């Protein structure tokens, strides 16, 4: 998950072509993360270990 609510800001960079940046972030600032269930990861890793 990327919990920050980024917003895209359009900028016009040269004739007839645009560049898209990030504008203000709505809300509060938070960290990006990934979750895994650790008992299932442990069982899986032990199963690799027996091989």
């Amino acid at each position, epitope marked *: 998950t990327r919990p920050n609510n980024n917003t895209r800001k359009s900028v016009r960079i040269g004739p007839g072509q645009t560049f898209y940046a990030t504008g203000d972030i709505i809300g*509060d*600032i938070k960290q990006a993360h990934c979750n895994i269930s650790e008992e299932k990861w442990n069982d899986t890793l032990q199963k690799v270990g027996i091989e």
Partner: antibody
Amino acid sequence: QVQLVQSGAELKKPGASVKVSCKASGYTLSDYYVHWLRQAPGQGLEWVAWINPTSGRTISPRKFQGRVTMTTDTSMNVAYMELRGLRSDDTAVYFCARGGWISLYVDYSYYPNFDSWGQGTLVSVS
Amino acid sequence: QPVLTQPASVSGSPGQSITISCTGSSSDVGSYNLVSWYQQHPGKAPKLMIYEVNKWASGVSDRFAGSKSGNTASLTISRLQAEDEANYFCSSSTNSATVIFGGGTKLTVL
């Protein structure tokens, strides 16, 4: 047990400034966001701002942008909210309140889940 | 920016049911289900009585319903007793990352 003891009331000239402080009791201020609220005589509850007391990051809706400036001193465990450029409207009962728990992975800053409230302190105007 | 609305004053009947509602925009009510209901007596501080529509607040009797529908939400009080003589504010959060209150409504006697 919880308390959000606020500072006393104080009347000011319109266009003046005032610092309003909100004390923590029974918990450390760094856990929760601090929301600032108001109630004029005979009017409803008006939402003013929140502060994430750790980073000092704040948002106020539109009406108070520039009016309200924010600080905290978590060593003293106190939260402050300063108003400038007063008007007759500011005869109102400001409340401080703690909102959501601060979690590094989910944004609870912005939604109306006020647990406990300040007793009420009155910025006033002649 | 505050826009949220509700009937400014109504009356109930003991033992019956009354509807106390609020309305907004898809930006703040239908965008997310984050809603709560508050009781404040004059001379005292408020008291959260609903949050997230129907997560159960402390000390709330089963009279106090909590529902949401699209652009609207309501406390559909049932059995509607008299010891709640002060107002019942609505509140929701906007997609602009702000909290909004209603104009308050009085659960009058009753």
